[PDB]
Amino acid sequence: CKGKGAKCSRLMYDCCTGSCRSGKC
């Protein structure tokens, strides 16, 4: 999983807590 701010895609479910945000986790 990833931590917020660690960039994100759109809905891959990488953010350990929240999810995709402003492009970042």
Side-chain angles (χ1 to χ4, degrees), residues 1-9 13-25:
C1 76
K2 282 273 276 277
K4 244 187 73 249
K7 235 230 140 104
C8 82
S9 162
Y13 319 116
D14 287 341
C15 316
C16 223
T17 54
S19 190
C20 237
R21 231 248 91 165
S22 179
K24 314 105 181 71
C25 255

